[PDB]
Amino acid sequence: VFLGFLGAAGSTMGAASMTLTVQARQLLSGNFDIPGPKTVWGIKQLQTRVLAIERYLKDQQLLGIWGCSGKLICCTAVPWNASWSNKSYEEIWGNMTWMQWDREINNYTNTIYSLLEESQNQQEKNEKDLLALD
Amino acid sequence: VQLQESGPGLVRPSETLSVTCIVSGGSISNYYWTWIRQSPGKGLEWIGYISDRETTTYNPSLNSRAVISRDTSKNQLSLQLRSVTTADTAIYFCATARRGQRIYGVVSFGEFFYYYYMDVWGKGTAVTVSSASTKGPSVFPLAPSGTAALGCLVKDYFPEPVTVSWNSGALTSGVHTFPAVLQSSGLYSLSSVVTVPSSSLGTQTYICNVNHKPSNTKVDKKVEP
Amino acid sequence: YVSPLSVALGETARISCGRQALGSRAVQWYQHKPGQAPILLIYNNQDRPSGIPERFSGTPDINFGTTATLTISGVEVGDEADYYCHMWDSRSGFSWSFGGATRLTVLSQPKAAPSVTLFPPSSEELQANKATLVCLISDFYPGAVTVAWKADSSPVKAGVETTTPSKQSNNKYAASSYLSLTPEQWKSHKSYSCQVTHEGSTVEKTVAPT
Amino acid sequence: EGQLVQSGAELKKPGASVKISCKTSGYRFNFYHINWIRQTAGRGPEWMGWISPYSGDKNLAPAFQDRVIMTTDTEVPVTSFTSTGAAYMEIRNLKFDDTGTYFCAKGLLRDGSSTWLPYLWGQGTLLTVSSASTKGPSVFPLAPSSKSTSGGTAALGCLVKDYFPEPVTVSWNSGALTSGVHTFPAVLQSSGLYSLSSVVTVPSSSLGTQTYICNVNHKPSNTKVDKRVEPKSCDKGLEV
Amino acid sequence: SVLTQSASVSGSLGQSVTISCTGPNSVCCSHKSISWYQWPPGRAPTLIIYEDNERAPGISPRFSGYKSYWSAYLTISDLRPEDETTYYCCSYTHNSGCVFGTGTKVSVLGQSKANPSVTLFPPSSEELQANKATLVCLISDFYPGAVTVAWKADSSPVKAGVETTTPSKQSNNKYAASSYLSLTPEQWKSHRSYSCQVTHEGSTVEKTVAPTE
Amino acid sequence: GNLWVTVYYGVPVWKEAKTTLFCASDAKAHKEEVHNIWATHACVPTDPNPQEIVLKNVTENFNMWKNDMVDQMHEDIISLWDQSLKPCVKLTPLCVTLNCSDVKIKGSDMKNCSFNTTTEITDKKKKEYALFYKLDVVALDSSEYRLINCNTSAVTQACPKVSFDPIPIHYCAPAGYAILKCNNKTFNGTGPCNNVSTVQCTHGIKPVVSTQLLLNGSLAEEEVVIRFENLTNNAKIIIVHLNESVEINCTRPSNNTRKSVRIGPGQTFFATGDIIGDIRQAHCNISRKKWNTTLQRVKEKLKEKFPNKTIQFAPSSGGDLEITTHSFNCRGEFFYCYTSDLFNSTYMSNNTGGANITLQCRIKQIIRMWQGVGQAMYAPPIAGNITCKSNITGLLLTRDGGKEKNDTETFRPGGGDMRDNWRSELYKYKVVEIKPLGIAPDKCKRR
Ligand SMILES: *[C@@H]1O[C@H](CO)[C@@H](O[C@@H]2O[C@H](CO)[C@@H](O[C@@H]3O[C@H](CO[C@H]4O[C@H](CO[C@H]5O[C@H](CO)[C@@H](O)[C@H](O)[C@@H]5O)[C@@H](O)[C@H](O[C@H]5O[C@H](CO)[C@@H](O)[C@H](O)[C@@H]5O)[C@@H]4O)[C@@H](O)[C@H](O[C@H]4O[C@H](CO)[C@@H](O)[C@H](O)[C@@H]4O[C@H]4O[C@H](CO)[C@@H](O)[C@H](O)[C@@H]4O[C@H]4O[C@H](CO)[C@@H](O)[C@H](O)[C@@H]4O)[C@@H]3O)[C@H](O)[C@H]2NC(C)=O)[C@H](O)[C@H]1NC(C)=O
Ligand SMILES: *[C@@H]1O[C@H](CO)[C@@H](O[C@@H]2O[C@H](CO)[C@@H](O[C@@H]3O[C@H](CO[C@H]4O[C@H](CO[C@H]5O[C@H](CO)[C@@H](O)[C@H](O)[C@@H]5O[C@H]5O[C@H](CO)[C@@H](O)[C@H](O)[C@@H]5O)[C@@H](O)[C@H](O[C@H]5O[C@H](CO)[C@@H](O)[C@H](O)[C@@H]5O)[C@@H]4O)[C@@H](O)[C@H](O[C@H]4O[C@H](CO)[C@@H](O)[C@H](O)[C@@H]4O[C@H]4O[C@H](CO)[C@@H](O)[C@H](O)[C@@H]4O)[C@@H]3O)[C@H](O)[C@H]2NC(C)=O)[C@H](O)[C@H]1NC(C)=O
Ligand SMILES: *[C@@H]1O[C@H](CO)[C@@H](O[C@@H]2O[C@H](CO)[C@@H](O[C@@H]3O[C@H](CO[C@H]4O[C@H](CO)[C@@H](O)[C@H](O)[C@@H]4O)[C@@H](O)[C@H](O[C@H]4O[C@H](CO)[C@@H](O)[C@H](O)[C@@H]4O)[C@@H]3O)[C@H](O)[C@H]2NC(C)=O)[C@H](O)[C@H]1NC(C)=O
Ligand SMILES: *[C@@H]1O[C@H](CO)[C@@H](O[C@@H]2O[C@H](CO)[C@@H](O[C@@H]3O[C@H](CO)[C@@H](O)[C@H](O)[C@@H]3O)[C@H](O)[C@H]2NC(C)=O)[C@H](O)[C@H]1NC(C)=O
Ligand SMILES: *[C@@H]1O[C@H](CO)[C@@H](O[C@@H]2O[C@H](CO)[C@@H](O[C@@H]3O[C@H](CO)[C@@H](O)[C@H](O)[C@@H]3O)[C@H](O)[C@H]2NC(C)=O)[C@H](O)[C@H]1NC(C)=O
Ligand SMILES: *[C@@H]1O[C@H](CO)[C@@H](O[C@@H]2O[C@H](CO)[C@@H](O[C@@H]3O[C@H](CO)[C@@H](O)[C@H](O)[C@@H]3O)[C@H](O)[C@H]2NC(C)=O)[C@H](O)[C@H]1NC(C)=O
Ligand SMILES: *[C@@H]1O[C@H](CO)[C@@H](O[C@@H]2O[C@H](CO)[C@@H](O[C@@H]3O[C@H](CO)[C@@H](O)[C@H](O)[C@@H]3O)[C@H](O)[C@H]2NC(C)=O)[C@H](O)[C@H]1NC(C)=O
Ligand SMILES: *[C@@H]1O[C@H](CO)[C@@H](O[C@@H]2O[C@H](CO)[C@@H](O)[C@H](O)[C@H]2NC(C)=O)[C@H](O)[C@H]1NC(C)=O
Ligand SMILES: *[C@@H]1O[C@H](CO)[C@@H](O[C@@H]2O[C@H](CO)[C@@H](O)[C@H](O)[C@H]2NC(C)=O)[C@H](O)[C@H]1NC(C)=O
Ligand SMILES: *[C@@H]1O[C@H](CO)[C@@H](O[C@@H]2O[C@H](CO)[C@@H](O)[C@H](O)[C@H]2NC(C)=O)[C@H](O)[C@H]1NC(C)=O
Ligand SMILES: *[C@@H]1O[C@H](CO)[C@@H](O)[C@H](O)[C@H]1NC(C)=O
Ligand SMILES: *[C@@H]1O[C@H](CO)[C@@H](O)[C@H](O)[C@H]1NC(C)=O
Ligand SMILES: *[C@@H]1O[C@H](CO)[C@@H](O)[C@H](O)[C@H]1NC(C)=O
Ligand SMILES: *[C@@H]1O[C@H](CO)[C@@H](O)[C@H](O)[C@H]1NC(C)=O
């Protein structure tokens, strides 16, 4: 189902995965502001919408330093450590929501970010480089 | 209603003028009574008024020399004016006032005012102020001489006015009392003439009654050719 | 204090008040004739008491800017009087003044011939060492009258006391002249004549001692 | 922490109706179905039916499709992921084969092939349907006996005798005594009366240092009996 | 209930035991999903297996599920003492209701048998004031669920007023029961001693009280 | 059982954060043609088709008293006043000596003053006169007066081409953010909202600055709502959303006029010229039946927070006039009315009902708006009479303190802080940021 932007925030994680592209386009452009507000308080919105570009580019670069690029859903090669969540499939995607899930990952998210990059693609691109000559 | 004024006619300066106002055709405690005067060469001047609560308010031009009172027993109104001068010689009327409240906004804010106005008036009593003294009028009969005229001449009196009647209510059509003249002696003089048919002479009696209220000179003069 | 206003007979007269109101007004109009009680014509700007003719109207108080004006439709010879505009308003407090009078003069009135009557001195006056000739003029319009005295066709200059012309009941003017003489001067000249001239009409009456 | 509490045990007359409640806590009451499952002595366990607190969609068993009505109350949000809800089941035309233990239960998952499956079960509600009047019990004290001579252990308790409604609870010292407490099941007399006994094993040396009082509560009769067991032992193996 | 299970299966401590769950072509397998429930009598059950073989959250991997074209099976590996209770199976679809089976009682043998503790209590004086007498024989802490109580009034069997309860599973993997002998005061005074004899499968525990004591 | 981490970009997850929202000038007001409105100076178009999305199964926590949209709106209004009063004519040379005298009323207060101002040239000097209401200091006590603002701060006249009419303004959420909206009708104000919408822009909110009586607000659609910040703490604001709107019609009938006096090279100062017609103060009418019904409804609703305690209310405390008056704007003139007769009820039934209920109302011309970077604004006069109708939709009340648990509880009007004025419209909105990058174990692997 479509439902709309942020519609599946109460739905299950699997059902919310269907609408990744809906909540993706709303992260970038909020329709051009025609001629600009200028004046005194225009710098407020100017910096607030430059910070949006900065955040979006930081996310895209975090994707690019992983294997995930130009794609929303993306599988990787890092095994799910049991000390995170310690729950089964379908015990997750059919019982939990994405907010409730994020609640259970923040403690260990900064390390998963490291394993997904320093150990995954920094080794994977090295292998592909060393295996594209012979 | 009917209003009739009464006064002395003559008052010496540095004294107190006093006038009375007899009312008829109603009550005196349920109305408001004001006094108006008129000096020779001046318009109607407003003296003051007295209320049903028997409270008075006077014109600040009189210099607090006026005072008004009531008398419910005799159903009459009073007016007194102290320290009179020659400028206070005037005809005094008493009139009846009726309340009208002009409202132009919220009454609770005081957006209104009272506008004094008096529907009923009287004929007014004349009062003269002079250091001189009253004098009895000398009345002379003017014998008829072909146009048929029968007159009485009041030759010298002071002060005005003088009432000239002809057989009470028996002669009213042809009566003509000319206005008085101010002679260089300070004495007024007038003439009251009537037009009587020629056939009525020799058989009818014609007297002219002369009333001078200041100095009692009630004189009836019988005119004959 | 009088404001003169001449209005032709038959048309409509508009007497404007003397003082302009500073706010919502409450104007009265009084009609005062010489020697008569003042009449209340219009009170409360337009309210008319019992008896007042419909020819008199007052401008009612509406919005602001309207001048209090007394309108007399079809004036008559009996409407010549003093007109007082008692002006009340919300921005002047107690108004003791009745305002200056506006004496109305109705013109275009048919003239009248001055009726003259001459009276010689009386017997009781002759025996009182006095003499007065009484020249009574009445029923003439307008009031411009010139009284003159002659004695055996000779103009008398001194001893003349003439009243100012004043109209009475018929709205026609009436004047009185008195010639003061002594008993020996009365029998002196043979014929005394009062000659009045009104609008050029020169009419003369004569008396003789008998 | 999805703890779910049911209503209290009741006795109703045959032909009337009864409404059992089910109050929840620890989860979003609108996320999982509520199932009703009964257990009678005759036909064993039987599934009555489930209802969705979110959509109101229900599935009733055909056997109970006539005389059972399931309803739900709107949830009262506590936090972003917990709430307090209530589900009611009203059954009419009560008979003899309907006396037993009724359970409400929380569903398993929010989407899949076995969503409504009863996962978390409540403490149960005992429902008796008979014409017999509610008769209160007569609590009697039990004299202490010897359980171990060389160790010195006394066993003393209370007897709850003669009562018609099945459920009856027994505590010790207003719940301040939980060690050694053992409550035996009731018994079915030829007259239809139930009776049970509770016993606590205490040390034989704690006769003047601790007071043992048994509190018998019987809600269908709305009765409370506080009995004091006399520490005067009578067994010959304990007096030594 | 057309979904027939196993009547009663026994097992060895530490080993495994398999329970069967089968029924007609209308209410079994192939198209339907089978679940399993550990149902302690008088207490709330527990989900252990759903969707044929998928365990419930918190369930040890000892429990296993299987489904064939005609029967499903629940395998209990590494038998524990607390695994001695009743087990039911359910046959359901996605939008249907749960169809419970007949029931299966699993007995776990190979455990240390317990000596039955038997205690006899005579009626108190408060009950004597009510013209009633009740002897209470409480049995606790025994392993085999088979006990027979005999009441002897002065070494003579008693048939009337005897009410024996069914053995229930104690919370400590043991069994307990009780027996009540109802006697009138005339029969309470006209005897010298009463005896509750619980005959165990390998012993016999007798408790004798006396009205005079 | 044997899973791998997987990245999902764009998951419906949000986090509470602060940001600077946008604004919409509605349809730009092409029909007015004037470009002197505070909002139309720099706001995006209206986007005529809104997009509100319900979020099923979502229960989000809200707190209107800790809402940053309110603080942002307050700071925007404060920094907007000064930007509107910057290129306008200042009245610093008008700080001269004034002769002054009471109104004529040849036998309500408004002074008739005269001063020696500078003419078109600075070498010459002429004398002018104007009516300066009552906002004058005695200097040393026909008596010499002084302009009130020549004491502290300075004075600048409001540009006559700028109107004080409130335009519908609604804040829009920037990219990467969204506004969650509580659709529960009878809502606490703080707590978990049972069902939540999401939007980019809020509803058309009119910046109506006022005290005690909230005007042109949004009516709660199910009964009245009494929202507290702390029902135990007496020093906290109590906002009241009414069910029905209470008509309030205010007028200044005194036909005035404006004089444009020349002071300097090319700036003309507008002053209140002589009055033409009857004189009368400002006044507001509030229907007595509707206000009595509103009072009894708010009273019955206030009996919920206090079971066995009677509730009464009295007029404001007193002293400072700005706090104890229903101050607002009306076509330019800043009416400050008295609200003693509104909360002096129970013992109020004189003349068998006041029918219309009229409240006296003064007018000022030199205001200091919450001391916003000092300064002061001179409101130019409006030639003629003035009328303005409005809808009371909300109230601001404060509870007294002391040993009051015995009998009753008092609820006097308040205000002062203009942020509560914005809280009565931003109580249902909250701004959150989207955290779109999520990671979850799934069954797949690369290579
Ligand atoms: C907030 O609430 C407050 C309070 O609720 C509101 O405040 C009110 O505001 C209004 C508007 O200004 C004020 O009205 C002025 O009222 C006066 C008086 O009102 C009355 O009095 C009349 C006469 O009464 C008395 O006299 C009679 C004898 O004649 C006597 O028997 C009686 O006992 C009493 O003593 C009543 O007739 C009148 O009743 C009627 O009219 C009402 C309005 O239509 C209607 O609602 C009633 O049902 C009833 O039908 C009422 O009781 C008004 O006179 C005044 O009108 C004038 O003044 C303005 C200038 O200010 C002028 O331009 C107008 O033309 C009008 O002037 C006329 O009347 C003068 C005599 O008074 C006359 O001299 C003028 O020439 C002019 O006349 C012509 O018109 C009259 C008819 O008016 C006609 O008869 C003549 O023949 C001639 O053609 C105002 O309307 C309220 O007083 C005030 N209330 C309070 C408590 O302050 C406020 O407005 C509210 N604000 C908001 C924003 O909502
Ligand atoms: C917000 O929170 C919400 C709550 O948490 C959350 O909702 C949860 O949503 C999910 C997904 O939306 C729900 O998911 C599933 O549950 C369905 C249950 O049922 C449907 O069945 C109901 C009961 O039906 C019985 O009773 C009816 C009478 O009431 C009878 O008419 C029926 O025939 C049926 O009867 C049976 O029993 C009788 C004996 O009593 C017997 O005689 C008879 O023969 C029969 O066996 C219906 O009430 C219900 O009706 C509603 O909804 C549908 C769809 O919207 C409408 O069309 C209907 O008109 C009606 O309004 C349903 O019909 C399961 O069916 C469903 O299973 C299928 O899909 C999943 C994948 O999602 C598969 O894994 C699964 O195997 C099933 O697959 C099969 O069906 C699909 C088609 O669905 C088919 O394509 C496929 O090939 C295969 O054949 C799934 O398990 C969940 O229940 C909700 N929870 C709660 C508590 O409500 C919501 O999502 C959240 N987010 C939001 C809102 O954004
Ligand atoms: C502040 O200012 C505002 C605006 O100026 C005022 O609001 C107006 O208030 C008046 C009176 O309160 C309203 O007038 C009324 O309109 C009602 C509705 O009217 C019509 O609709 C009905 C629908 O059935 C039709 O049948 C009817 O023919 C009309 O087309 C009327 O019902 C009211 O009538 C009452 O009086 C008449 C006259 O006697 C009776 O015949 C009726 O039966 C009835 O009893 C009344 O006429 C007006 O509509 C309001 N305008 C707006 C825009 O809202 C505030 O009142 C004012 N407040 C204060 C405190 O000053
Ligand atoms: C759906 O997901 C929720 C989590 O969002 C699952 O609930 C959780 O269940 C576990 C047990 O499986 C609970 O853990 C326990 O916590 C208690 C705390 O007192 C502790 O004592 C226990 O030893 C155990 O560790 C956890 O608290 C609970 N969380 C919540 C929020 O309820 C739920 O089981 C899932 N449902 C399924 C898979 O059907
Ligand atoms: C210039 O500013 C000073 C502020 O420092 C002004 O002084 C203050 O004027 C107010 C207004 O009257 C005084 O307040 C009042 O106090 C009286 C009792 O004394 C009370 O009845 C009133 O309700 C009001 O609260 C205030 O006391 C006074 N402060 C000082 C320190 O004098 C001053 O008036 C201004 N104008 C000048 C100096 O011309
Ligand atoms: C919208 O939000 C409000 C609160 O922010 C929700 O209302 C609160 O709802 C609960 C249960 O619906 C009410 O509780 C009950 O009060 C009654 C009367 O005292 C009592 O008998 C009950 O046992 C229960 O305690 C609570 O009073 C109410 N809050 C207030 C201030 O009245 C409301 O439910 C939400 N809207 C929806 C559609 O859920
Ligand atoms: C606006 O909100 C107020 C909140 O107080 C509403 O007030 C009350 O409204 C109810 C209707 O839901 C009135 O109740 C009923 O009372 C009458 C007797 O007066 C009875 O016959 C009905 O059966 C019903 O029970 C209630 O009286 C009224 N006042 C109070 C103090 O509670 C008002 O109705 C709302 N108006 C609109 C247009 O939504
Ligand atoms: C409405 O406001 C009241 C006042 O704070 C809330 O009451 C408190 O709620 C919190 C959160 O559950 C509890 O921890 C407190 O113990 C409550 N205190 C009192 C005195 O009630 C209430 O929860 C709010 N309700 C909603 C739906 O927002
Ligand atoms: C929250 O619940 C209320 C009550 O059901 C919803 O209110 C209605 O919303 C629909 C959809 O816009 C309108 O057509 C109705 O007119 C509303 N009625 C009332 C009485 O409010 C509200 O939309 C829900 N909001 C969310 C986000 O789910
Ligand atoms: C305020 O005072 C001024 C001056 O005292 C008033 O102006 C005088 O008004 C009269 C009549 O309108 C004029 O003849 C004078 O020439 C004016 N004086 C000056 C200096 O201009 C003014 O009228 C007063 N205000 C009001 C409303 O009456
Ligand atoms: C999970 O992470 C912890 C902490 O770094 C580590 O000790 C553990 O070995 C990890 N487990 C796996 C399966 O990698
Ligand atoms: C203005 O200046 C004149 C002298 O030119 C002076 O007489 C007058 O008093 C001054 N005005 C005031 C208000 O003092
Ligand atoms: C509410 O008031 C109480 C007592 O005054 C205080 O303890 C508490 O912190 C307050 N809560 C707030 C201000 O959020
Ligand atoms: C309420 O108003 C009346 C009438 O003006 C007044 O007498 C009374 O004192 C007022 N009450 C209060 C508490 O101010």
The count of CB pairs under 8 A between chains B and F is 15
User: Is A88 within a domain?
Assistant: yes
User: Is D209 within a domain?
Assistant: yes
Ligand 10 atom having least distance to the Cα of F127: 20
Contacts of A133 (CB under 8 A, 6+ apart): none
| CB F73, CB F221: distance < 8 Å | no
| CB E142, CB E174: distance < 8 Å | yes
Q: Where in the sequence is the domain holding B188, given as residue range(s)?
A: 138-223
DSSP state of F74: H
Continuous H helices in E51-204? 125-128, 185-189
Helix (H, G, I), strand (E, B) or coil at E149: strand
Structure tokens at E99: 């169809």
Distance between CA atoms of residues F425 and C190, nearest Å? 117
User: Is A2 within a domain?
Assistant: no
Kind of pairing, strands F97-98 and F60-63? unpaired
- Within 6 A (CB) of ligand 8 lie D 78; F 188, 191-192
Last residue of a domain, one of B102, B129, B156: B129
Clarify whether residues D113 and D177 are in a common domain: no
Q: By the CB < 8 Å criterion, does E57 face chain A?
A: yes
| CB D211, CB D160: distance < 8 Å | no
Q: Which residue type sits at B141?
A: P
Chains F and A touch (3+ CB pairs under 8 A): yes
Contacts of F319 (CB under 8 A, 6+ apart): none
∠ CA B49-B50-B51 to the nearest 5 degrees? Answer: 125
Chain F positions touching C91 (Cβ under 8 A) are 104-106, 278-279
Distance between CA atoms of residues C178 and C45, nearest Å? 48
The sign of the CA dihedral A96, A102, A107, A113 is positive
For residue E188, CA distances in Å to C139, D191, E135, E138 come to 159, 21, 10, 20
Peptide bond into C142 cis (omega under 30): yes
Q: Where are the domains of chain E?
A: 8-109, 117-209
Of C34, C35, C56, the C-alpha closest to C46 is C56
Please, which residues 94-133 of chain B have a Cβ atom closer than 8 Å to chain F?
Answer: 104-106, 108-109, 111
Clarify whether residues B161 and B210 are in a common domain: yes
Q: To test the ligand 14 pocket, which listed residue (F288, F341, F344, F348) has its Cβ within 8 A of the most ligand atoms? A: F344
User: Is A70 within a domain?
Assistant: yes
Of D183, D153, D165, the C-alpha closest to D223 is D165
Is the Cβ pair C122, B143 closer than 8 Å? Answer: yes
Chain D positions touching A91 (Cβ under 8 A) are 109
Phi first, then psi: what are they for B65, rounded to 5°? -85, -10
Q: Which residue type sits at F188?
A: N
Q: Which residue type sits at C79?
A: D
User: Is D75 within a domain?
Assistant: yes
CA of E61 to the centre of ligand 11 (A): 22
Phi first, then psi: what are they for E189, rounded to 5°? -85, -30
| CB-closest option in D30, D54, D80 to F61 | D80
List the resolution, Å.
3.4
Q: By the CB < 8 Å criterion, does E124 face chain D?
A: yes
Task: Please give the class, per CATH, of domain C109-210.
Answer: mainly beta
Residue in the block written with tokens 């005072």: B67
Peptide bond into B161 cis (omega under 30): yes
Residue in the block written with tokens 């503790």: E117
Q: Which long-range contacts (CB under 8 A, 24 or more apart) does D167-170 make?
A: D167/D9, D167/D126, D167/D218, D167/D219, D167/D220, D168/D137, D168/D194, D168/D196, D168/D216, D168/D217, D168/D218, D169/D216, D169/D217, D169/D218, D169/D219, D170/D198, D170/D214, D170/D215, D170/D216, D170/D217
Of F159, D157, D174, the C-alpha closest to E176 is D157
F346-357: b (≥16 Cβ within 10 Å) or e: eeeeeeeebeeb
End-to-end CA, chain F: 20
What is the residue-wise DSSP string for D182-237? EE------TTS-EEEEEEEEEETT-SSS---EEEEEETTTTEEEEEE-------HH
How many of the other CB atoms lie within 10 Å of CB of A12?
Answer: 22
F186 lines ligand 7 (CB under 6 A): no
Shortest Cα distance from A132 to chain F (angstroms)? 15
Distance between CA atoms of residues E61 and B67, nearest Å? 123
The residue among E89, E118, E121, E174 with the most chain D CBs within 10 A of its CB, best to mutate, is E121
What homologous superfamily does CATH list for C1-108? Immunoglobulins (2.60.40.10)
Number of structural domains, chain B?
2
Distance between CA atoms of residues C63 and F432, nearest Å? 59
Distance between CA atoms of residues E139 and B117, nearest Å? 120
Q: Where in the sequence is the domain holding A108, given as residue range(s)?
A: 7-130
CATH label of the domain that carries residue D209 = 2.60.40.10
E155 CB-contact burial (10 Å; exposed 0-12 / middle 13-18 / buried 19+) = exposed
Helix (H, G, I), strand (E, B) or coil at E213: coil
Helix (H, G, I), strand (E, B) or coil at F92: helix
Kind of pairing, strands D145-148 and D169-172? unpaired
In the sheet that holds F258-262, the strands lie side by side as: F136-137, F145-147, F97-98, F112-118, F125-131, F268-272, F258-262
Distance between CA atoms of residues D179 and C91, nearest Å? 100
∠ CA F128-F134-F135 to the nearest 5 degrees? Answer: 85
Q: Which helix (H) or strand (E) holds A54?
A: helix A42-65
DSSP state of E179: E
What homologous superfamily does CATH list for E117-209? Immunoglobulins (2.60.40.10)
For atom 21 of ligand 10, which residue has the closest CA?
Answer: F129
Residue in the block written with tokens 């602001």: C64
- Within 6 A (CB) of ligand 10 lie F 104, 112, 129, 274-275
E128 CB-contact burial (10 Å; exposed 0-12 / middle 13-18 / buried 19+) = middle
Q: Which fold has domain E8-109?
A: Immunoglobulin-like (2.60.40)
F191 lines ligand 6 (CB under 6 A): yes
| CB D68, CB D87: distance < 8 Å | no
Q: Which residue type sits at B87?
A: A
Q: By the CB < 8 Å criterion, does D138 face chain E?
A: yes
Contacts of D137 (CB under 8 A, 6+ apart): D160, D161, D162, D163, D168, D195, D216, D218, D221, D223, D225
Contacts of E47 (CB under 8 A, 6+ apart): D108, D117, D118, D119, E35, E36, E37, E56, E59
Clarify whether residues B7 and B62 are in a common domain: yes
Q: Which helix (H) or strand (E) holds C145?
A: strand C145-151
CA dihedral D51, D52, D53, D55 (to 10 degrees): -130
Clarify whether residues D222 and D163 are in a common domain: yes
Phi first, then psi: what are they for F152, rounded to 5°? -125, 150
Distance between CA atoms of residues C110 and C77, nearest Å? 10
| CB C85, CB C99: distance < 8 Å | yes
For residue C193, CA distances in Å to B178, B194, C148, E47 come to 20, 22, 8, 155
CA of F222 to the centre of ligand 7 (A): 10
Chain D positions touching F57 (Cβ under 8 A) are 28, 30-31, 54
Of F64, F103, F54, the C-alpha closest to F426 is F64
How many of the other CB atoms lie within 10 Å of CB of F399?
Answer: 24
Q: Which residue type sits at F366?
A: I
Kind of pairing, strands B163-166 and B207-211? antiparallel
Clarify whether residues D117 and D177 are in a common domain: no
Of F103, D157, A37, the C-alpha closest to C22 is F103
Last residue of a domain, one of B83, B106, B129: B129
Structure tokens at D96: 């003899």
Of C113, C106, C84, the C-alpha closest to C19 is C84
Q: Which residue type sits at D51?
A: I
Last residue of a domain, one of D95, D129, D163: D129
Residues of chain C with CATH 2.60.40.10: 1-108, 109-210
| CB D43, CB D97: distance < 8 Å | yes
Helix (H, G, I), strand (E, B) or coil at F425: helix
How many of the other CB atoms lie within 10 Å of CB of F21?
Answer: 24
Contacts of F293 (CB under 8 A, 6+ apart): none
Distance between CA atoms of residues F147 and D207, nearest Å? 95
User: Is A1 within a domain?
Assistant: no
| CB F318, CB F417: distance < 8 Å | no
Residue in the block written with tokens 């929303």: A72
Peptide bond into D165 cis (omega under 30): no
CA of F364 to the centre of ligand 14 (A): 26
Clarify whether residues B154 and B100 are in a common domain: no
Distance between CA atoms of residues F107 and F109, nearest Å? 14
Number of structural domains, chain D?
2
- Beta strands per DSSP E along A5-119: 73-79
Q: Where in the sequence is the domain holding D165, given as residue range(s)?
A: 138-228
D83-94: b (≥16 Cβ within 10 Å) or e: bebbbbbebeeb
Chain F positions touching D30 (Cβ under 8 A) are 57
Number of structural domains, chain A?
1
Last residue of a domain, one of D102, D129, D156: D129
Determination technique for this entry: X-ray
Last residue of a domain, one of B92, B108, B129: B129
Distance between CA atoms of residues F177 and F438, nearest Å? 17
| CB F278, CB F254: distance < 8 Å | yes
